Amino acid sequence: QIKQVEDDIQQLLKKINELTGIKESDTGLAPPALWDLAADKQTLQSEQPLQVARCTKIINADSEDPKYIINVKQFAKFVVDLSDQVAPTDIEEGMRVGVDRNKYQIHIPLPPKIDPTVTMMQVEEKPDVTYSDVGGCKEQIEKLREVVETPLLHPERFVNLGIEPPKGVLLFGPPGTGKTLCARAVANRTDACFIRVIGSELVQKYVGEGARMVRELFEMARTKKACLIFFDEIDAIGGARFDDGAGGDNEVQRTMLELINQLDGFDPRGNIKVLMATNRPDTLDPALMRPGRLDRKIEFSLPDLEGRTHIFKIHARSMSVERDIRFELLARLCPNSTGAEIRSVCTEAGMFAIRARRKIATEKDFLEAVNKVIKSYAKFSATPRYMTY
Amino acid sequence: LNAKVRLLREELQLLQEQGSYVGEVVRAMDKKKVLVKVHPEGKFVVDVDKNIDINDVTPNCRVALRNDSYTLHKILPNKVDPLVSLMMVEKVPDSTYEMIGGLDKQIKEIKEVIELPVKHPELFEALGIAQPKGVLLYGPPGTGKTLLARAV
Amino acid sequence: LRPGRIDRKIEFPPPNEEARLDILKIHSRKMNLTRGINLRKIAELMPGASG
Amino acid sequence: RLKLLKLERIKDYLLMEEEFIRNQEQMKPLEEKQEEERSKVDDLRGTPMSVGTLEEIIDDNHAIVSTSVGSEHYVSILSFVDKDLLEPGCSVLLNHKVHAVIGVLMDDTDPLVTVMKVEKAPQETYADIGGLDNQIQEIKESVELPLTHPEYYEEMGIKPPKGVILYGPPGTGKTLLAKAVANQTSATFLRVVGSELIQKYLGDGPKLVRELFRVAEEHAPSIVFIDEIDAIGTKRYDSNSGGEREIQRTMLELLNQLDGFDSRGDVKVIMATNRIETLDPALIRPGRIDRKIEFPLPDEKTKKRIFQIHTSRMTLADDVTLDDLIMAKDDLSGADIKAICTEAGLMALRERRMKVTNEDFKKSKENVLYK
Ligand SMILES: Nc1ncnc2c1ncn2[C@@H]1O[C@H](COP(=O)(O)OP(=O)(O)OP(=O)(O)O)[C@@H](O)[C@H]1O
Ligand SMILES: Nc1ncnc2c1ncn2[C@@H]1O[C@H](COP(=O)(O)OP(=O)(O)O)[C@@H](O)[C@H]1O
Ligand SMILES: Nc1ncnc2c1ncn2[C@@H]1O[C@H](COP(=O)(O)OP(=O)(O)O)[C@@H](O)[C@H]1O
Numbered sequence: 001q002i003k004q005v006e007d008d009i010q011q012l013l014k015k016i017n018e019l020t021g022i023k024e025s026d027t028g029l030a031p032p033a034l035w036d037l038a039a040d041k042q043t044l045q046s047e048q049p050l051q052v053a054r055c056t057k058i059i060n061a062d063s064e065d066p067k068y069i070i071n072v073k074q075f076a077k078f079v080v081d082l083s084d085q086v087a088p089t090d091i092e093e094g095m096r097v098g099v100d101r102n103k104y105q106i107h108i109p110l111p112p113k114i115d116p117t118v119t120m121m122q123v124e125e126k127p128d129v130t131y132s133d134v135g136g137c138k139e140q141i142e143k144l145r146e147v148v149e150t151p152l153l154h155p156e157r158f159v160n161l162g163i164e165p166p167k168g169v170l171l172f173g174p175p176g177t178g179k180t181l182c183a184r185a186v187a188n189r190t191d192a193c194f195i196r197v198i199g200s201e202l203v204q205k206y207v208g209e210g211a212r213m214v215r216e217l218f219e220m221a222r223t224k225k226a227c228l229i230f231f232d233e234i235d236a237i238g239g240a241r242f243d244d245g246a247g248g249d250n251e252v253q254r255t256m257l258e259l260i261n262q263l264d265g266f267d268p269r270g271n272i273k274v275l276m277a278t279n280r281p282d283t284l285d286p287a288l289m290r291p292g293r294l295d296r297k298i299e300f301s302l303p304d305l306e307g308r309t310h311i312f313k314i315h316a317r318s319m320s321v322e323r324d325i326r327f328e329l330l331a332r333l334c335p336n337s338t339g340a341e342i343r344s345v346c347t348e349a350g351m352f353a354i355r356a357r358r359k360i361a362t363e364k365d366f367l368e369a370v371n372k373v374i375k376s377y378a379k380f381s382a383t384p385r386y387m388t389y
Numbered sequence: 390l391n392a393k394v395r396l397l398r399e400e401l402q403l404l405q406e407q408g409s410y411v412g413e414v415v416r417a418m419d420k421k422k423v424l425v426k427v428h429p430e431g432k433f434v435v436d437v438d439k440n441i442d443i444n445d446v447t448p449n450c451r452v453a454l455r456n457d458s459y460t461l462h463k464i465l466p467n468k469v470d471p472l473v474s475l476m477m478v479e480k481v482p483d484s485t486y487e488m489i490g491g492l493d494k495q496i497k498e499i500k501e502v503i504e505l506p507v508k509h510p511e512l513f514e515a516l517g518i519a520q521p522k523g524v525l526l527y528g529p530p531g532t533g534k535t536l537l538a539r540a541v
Numbered sequence: 542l543r544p545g546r547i548d549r550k551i552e553f554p555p556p557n558e559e560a561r562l563d564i565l566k567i568h569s570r571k572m573n574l575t576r577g578i579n580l581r582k583i584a585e586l587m588p589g590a591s592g
Numbered sequence: 593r594l595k596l597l598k599l600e601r602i603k604d605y606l607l608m609e610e611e612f613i614r615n616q617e618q619m620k621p622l623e624e625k626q627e628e629e630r631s632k633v634d635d636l637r638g639t640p641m642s643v644g645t646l647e648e649i650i651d652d653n654h655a656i657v658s659t660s661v662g663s664e665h666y667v668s669i670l671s672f673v674d675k676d677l678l679e680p681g682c683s684v685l686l687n688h689k690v691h692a693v694i695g696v697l698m699d700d701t702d703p704l705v706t707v708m709k710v711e712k713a714p715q716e717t718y719a720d721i722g723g724l725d726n727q728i729q730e731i732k733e734s735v736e737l738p739l740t741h742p743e744y745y746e747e748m749g750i751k752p753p754k755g756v757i758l759y760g761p762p763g764t765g766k767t768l769l770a771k772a773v774a775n776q777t778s779a780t781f782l783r784v785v786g787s788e789l790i791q792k793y794l795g796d797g798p799k800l801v802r803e804l805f806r807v808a809e810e811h812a813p814s815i816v817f818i819d820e821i822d823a824i825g826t827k828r829y830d831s832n833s834g835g836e837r838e839i840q841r842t843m844l845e846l847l848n849q850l851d852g853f854d855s856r857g858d859v860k861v862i863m864a865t866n867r868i869e870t871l872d873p874a875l876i877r878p879g880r881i882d883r884k885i886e887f888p889l890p891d892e893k894t895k896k897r898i899f900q901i902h903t904s905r906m907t908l909a910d911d912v913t914l915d916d917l918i919m920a921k922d923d924l925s926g927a928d929i930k931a932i933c934t935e936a937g938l939m940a941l942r943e944r945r946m947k948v949t950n951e952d953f954k955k956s957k958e959n960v961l962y963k
């Protein structure tokens with residue numbers, strides 16, 4: 001009777017759909033559970049649409065009946081007045097006025113414009129990485145934790161001593177040392193607005209578009225009460241300014257200068273704390289590296305023996321390794337290696353076991369993995385160059 | 390005669406009707422709706438009229454939309470093919486083997502490698518070799534490369 | 542130039558004397574040529590020329 | 593049986609559900625009937641519905657919508673819309689008269705998505721490859737095995753390698769293994785090239801990289817095959833406005849996409865090249881790409897296998913010896929072998945025979961393998 005049961009189950013599903021709502025996703029429609037037609041009719045008959053304009057000037061701002069010069073974007077500019085439901089103080093000379101049609105007056109104050117590209121940068125889903133997934137950089141974790149979390153968690157211990165906590169960090173180190181890993185850990189552990197930015201995301205085709213979105217990013221952060229920004233791969237736009245003779249890097253230098261002025265200029269930067277992740281901290285501009293903008297430069301040097309042993313432990317926690325581990329032997333056997341190298345060694349040990357069709361990875365498998373990842377791949381390593389860099 | 394005159398008198402009345410927009414269909418939805426880009430600004434979704442099988446509104450075709458409450462009510466003659474427009478802009482002069490002269494072995498080679506794979510894709514299958522798909526023509530400027538390509 | 546992509550490479554060298562004569566005949570078909578023109582002589586007079 | 597009783601415990605609650613759903617549907621007062629609600633939806637959504645961008649979401653029942661003409665209407669969003677799939681930059685359906693958000697769009701994909709996706713299985717298969725046993729094993733362990741038997745990896749406690757580099761001289765089977773993986777895999781195959789990543793305006797390269805990997809995530813499980821990644825490097829083009837440094841920023845965007853802040857979904861990266869020394873070591877690092885596998889020129893046995901594979905369909909003449917080709921002791925590649933076979937067939941059809949001969953093979957030698 002099994003097939004009869006499945007046939008009945010699917011027929012029942014088909015009937016439930018046919019009588020409740022089946023398929024409406026072509027025109028992005030919703031399931032009919034949350035369909036408040038009674039409310040939406042009153043919405044369309046009682047809430048008139050409002051065209052978004054900008055209040056340019058307030059003629060006769062005194063208590064006398066004022067007049068506001070609005071500029072309905074790309075439509076027209078008008079002299080208008082406020083709705084009797086809107087208080088005069090709720091509207092300034094730069095807010096998005098939000099005026100109705102038909103004697104453009106039914107006002108709703110409206111926040112600053114944010115580019116969709118910039119606003120699609122807040123970290124909504126927090127990374128699944130924690131501070132316990134980072135090993136061999138205890139002091140770096142402590143310093144980064146201080147700077148980014150501790151003021152945002154217990155500000156009393158800072159205002160008691162009257163200290164301004166450092167607001168700005170530069171995580172710098174060779175390719176694969178825990179820079180982006182620690183950024184993800186900070187994003188996961190932080191209760192605040194985390195905004196990730198990628199140096200390549202500030203390269204835009206039209207002059208003044210990189211600086212424009214830097215300004216928008218920082219002013220959105222300012223609108224939010226407690227914000228951590230994280231410029232990863234900051235090498236992209238952050239580079240020492242050189243005159244040249246053909247105007248090279250003028251646009252990227254302009255957006256970098258906008259970032260500089262936003263970090264520390266003729267303005268209180270706000271409650272924004274910034275991270276700069278890089279593996280070439282020798283191109284960054286001296287102004288960018290000034291401790292008024294990057295206060296707490298942190299070096300993610302290649303882990304020492306203890307750090308490598310800890311990283312091996314971390315990456316082999318969930319593996320099916322055998323009794324005797326000798327991860328200390330592995331750490332001494334693969335010096336001047338990165339956490340990326342170590343995780344690859346663990347993965348290759350697991351794959352050697354899988355290829356042999358075993359369910360237990362042994363010390364011989366780990367030694368083969370070290371030979372494959374550290375010795376054979378030694379010619380593709382980035383450390384010999386990026387340690388100089 | 391009476392039908393003619395009545396047609397004129399109703400013509401005066403029905404010429405005051407709003408003219409219909411023209412829009413290019415980009416994609417046909419379900420439930421008898423079509424995504425149409427109306428010239429020169431605007432991209433709407435319009436319900437098809439109950440006189441046109443929605444199966445005939447394949448993308449990239451001009452269609453008339455009624456003035457008020459846009460409603461696809463006619464499939465106008467298709468717009469010029471984008472490829473036709475591109476080739477009209479490029480304006481590669483038309484060529485033929487009789488216009489070509491002096492390169493007969495080259496005509497033979499290009500004939501093999503272009504004609505045979507598309508006309509007789511069985512000789513190559515019987516031989517057991519993949520059909521050729523790349524030709525490169527050496528030669529100084531104006532020696533007949535574009536001429537022979539166009540002719541073949 | 543890797544020997545796996547260009548399935549054929551044809552060569553269009555500068556026209557020979559006979560090729561130049563053929564090109565001249567083809568391109569002069571479309572004009573009033575007075576009876577008895579030595580297109581072969583013209584082709585010989587113009588060596589090392591393209592179509 | 594236990595499973596039969598499970599499915600019965602499902603079907604009985606389902607029948608309960610239809611009983612309740614009917615009951616309610618009839619006691620509705622000749623209104624709110626699913627069809628009636630759908631008709632009311634059509635009534636309230638207007639006959640034309642303009643497509644406009646969603647600039648930002650202010651809250652449920654409100655949003656700023658940019659009309660095609662540039663106006664920025666602040667308007668309500670009705671219960672009709674899912675209040676989901678709505679992110680700044682999305683298309684939105686707006687009631688003509690009141691511009692109310694009454695639907696969403698982008699049900700279609702972009703031409704970039706269409707071109708990148710390989711909506712086909714290449715005819716080449718692992719059986720059509722001869723000599724790359726270890727390379728096939730490793731690429732399978734990286735791309736196919738984690739998809740077909742995730743149990744191995746999950747039980748072992750390791751994650752599969754994220755990327756693989758196929759590095760080898762000009763023609764050794766790198767794109768051939770890419771083709772075989774595309775043929776056999778159940779994931780969506782997205783093919784790109786390095787010169788194809790090198791864009792013209794400033795910021796187009798990074799934008800294309802981001803779009804490619806976003807498409808890969810959207811169509812996950814996916815395999816992103818970047819052939820000739822060294823083209824982003826070695827080659828220099830005038831169309832590139834930014835030049836070497838814009839190339840560097842595109843490479844940096846690739847770095848971030850391969851291993852950056854954002855958590856990847858199911859997107860395995862294959863990347864092929866014949867000049868691996870020109871690649872940025874940060875790009876090749878183990879976290880981004882492990883499994884750097886070489887494709888050396890075939891030895892004598894492998895060359896024999898290539899000739900058998902590529903002559904399996906040709907009617908070789910009895911006198912033809914597929915041994916002199918191999919005895920030619922040069923840097924012979926599989927591409928060279930295939931081209932020799934193909935041009936031998938071309939001379940066969942030229943000289944009108946359906947059977948390839950030793951002379952045809954020798955003149956093919958002299959023609960394509962110019963040595
Ligand atoms: N100290 C570490 N502890 C644990 N895992 C580490 C460590 N360093 C690197 N890893 C592993 O390597 C990856 C983290 O590298 P990450 O992305 O942070 O590199 P990065 O320093 O930002 O380098 P890049 O210059 O390439 O951007 C993860 O796989 C993580 O498991
Ligand atoms: N072999 C030929 N026979 C006849 N005309 C030729 C030949 N080669 C070139 N021409 C003439 O030269 C002109 C330009 O040739 P073109 O097709 O541009 O050659 P290419 O592609 O090598 O530049 C054409 O108008 C064509 O009529
Ligand atoms: N076992 C093999 N080794 C090398 N090449 C092969 C093999 N089998 C077939 N080929 C041929 O090699 C070509 C693919 O070469 P490819 O891997 O693209 O080289 P590259 O990527 O370095 O340019 C195909 O045309 C294919 O027919």
Ligand SMILES: [Mg+2]
Pocket residue numbers: 179180232233277851852853
């Ligand atoms: Mg990183």
Ligand SMILES: [Mg+2]
Pocket residue numbers: 766767819864
């Ligand atoms: Mg290739």
